[PDB]
From a paper:
We show that the orthologue identified in A. hydrophila (AhlABC) is a haemolytic tripartite α-PFT, requiring all three components for maximal lysis, and we present the structures of the soluble forms of monomeric AhlB and tetrameric AhlC and the decameric pore form of AhlB. Structural and sequence analysis suggests this method of pore assembly may well occur throughout the tripartite α-PFT family.
AhlB folds into a compact five helical bundle structure (α1–α5), with an associated domain constructed from a mix of three alpha helices and three beta strands. These hydrophobic residues are thus shielded from solvent by packing against residues of helix α4 (E254–V270), α3a (residues V170–L186), α4a (residues G225–G239), the N-terminal helix (α1, residue G12–V34) and the C-terminus (residues T331–A359), which forms a short beta strand (β3) and helix (α5a). In this soluble structure of AhlB all non-Ala/Gly hydrophobic residues of the hydrophobic head are packed away in the core of the protein as the hydrophobic β-tongue. Comparison of the soluble and pore structures of AhlB shows that a major rearrangement of the protein occurs between them, in a similar way to that seen in the ClyA pore formation.
Residue numbers in the entry: 7 to 360
The structure:
């Protein structure tokens, strides 16, 4: 795997999980004070949610910065590489070459360590989310049995939501991935409720996993709304369609489906994180082989100079360009203002028809 794809994929996935985590943290705790036979159930829900907000926080506060630092190291690396054929003028001895390559390999290996450590901490996050996400599911089914509801209809909703959530995830990835590397590009995010929470009275909106992301320029917002609105509506349809499910249970299940959504974002992050480490490992081995071959009679400093100048003009200029535009996108990302009583699907529906 090339350094430009590993970087493009992790940047892309990070901006999506970032948004998702923001939606986790925005979720309000449930309110069942009306039915005192559910206090134990409320408590359970809200303790589970705080675990979900804990995982979200850990991602934004510990993992995201390392991802940002990684992107900056890719630039560090290639700028150091381009600089060597300038620091070592045409005479330069084999010794000089061995010292320079050995030094930049050291620096690169250190970047490999940051990236592999990151992969390891995302893996561990995911594993803890799988457990924490599976336990929440049981807190929902416990509540459902306590209101003598059908566990079978509940199950068919969870299954139906999981399939749609994957469609959403898919389209969002498509939007971000397709605009990520456009030189002037930016992104806007939208966080809203997965279901209507005002037509009937009791208002507990569920924004966890209720998300949308679009290109900020031109008619990017509209263009974005169009590919997103189908999948988003489909989900809202499933929570609004007539069902035997208690309302209190419908809330906890909405939350629970968002919780699941968080863990799938983590699993997507494992994938991207793995790809970026492998890109670093492939790079440190190539450097490793370059040193080894200079050390034998196979290559020379003059040959490496040649190889890194044609690289500096062709494949490196590309990478360094993308690194600039990627750091811009991630730092530039901006949130759309969503009306407090709106839904994410309705919001996007209306933006899609402008």
């Amino acid at each position: 795997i090339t350094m430009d794809q590993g970087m493009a994929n992790q940047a892309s996935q990070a901006m999506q999980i970032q948004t998702y985590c923001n939606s986790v943290k925005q979720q309000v705790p449930v309110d069942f004070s009306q039915f005192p036979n559910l206090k134990d159930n409320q408590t359970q829900i809200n303790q589970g949610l705080d675990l979900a907000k804990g995982h979200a926080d850990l991602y934004l506060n510990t993992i995201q910065p390392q991802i940002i630092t990684n992107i900056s190291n890719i630039s560090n690396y290639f700028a150091l590489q381009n600089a060597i054929p300038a620091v070592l003028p045409p005479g330069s001895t084999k010794a000089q070459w061995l010292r320079q390559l050995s030094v930049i390999k050291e620096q690169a290996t250190e970047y490999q360590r940051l990236s592999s450590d990151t992969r390891l901490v995302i893996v561990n996050l995911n594993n803890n989310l799988i457990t924490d996400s599976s336990n929440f599911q049981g807190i929902v089914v416990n509540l459902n049995s306590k209101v003598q509801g059908d566990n079978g209809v509940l199950a068919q909703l969870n299954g139906d939501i999981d399939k749609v959530n994957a469609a959403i995830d898919g389209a969002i990835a498509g939007i971000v991935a397709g605009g990520l590397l456009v030189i002037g590009g930016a992104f806007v995010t939208a966080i809203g409720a997965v279901a209507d929470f005002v037509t009937a009275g009791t208002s507990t909106p569920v924004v966890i996993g209720g998300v949308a992301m679009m290109v900020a320029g031109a008619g990017g917002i509209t263009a974005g709304a169009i590919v997103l609105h189908n999948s988003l509506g489909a989900r809202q349809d499933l929570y609004q369609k007539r069902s035997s499910l208690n309302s209190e249970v419908l809330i906890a299940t909405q939350i629970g489906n968002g919780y699941k959504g968080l863990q799938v974002q983590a699993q997507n992050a494992v994938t991207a994180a793995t790809q970026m480490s492998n890109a670093w490992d492939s790079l440190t081995s190539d450097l490793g082989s370059l040193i080894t071959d200079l050390d034998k009679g196979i290559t020379s400093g003059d040959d490496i100079r040649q190889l890194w100048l044609t690289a500096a003009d062709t494949t490196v200029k590309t990478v360094l360009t993308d690194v600039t535009t990627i750091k811009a996108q991630m730092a530039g990302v901006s949130p759309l203002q969503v009306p407090q009583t709106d839904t994410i699907a309705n919001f996007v529906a209306r933006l899609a028809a402008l």
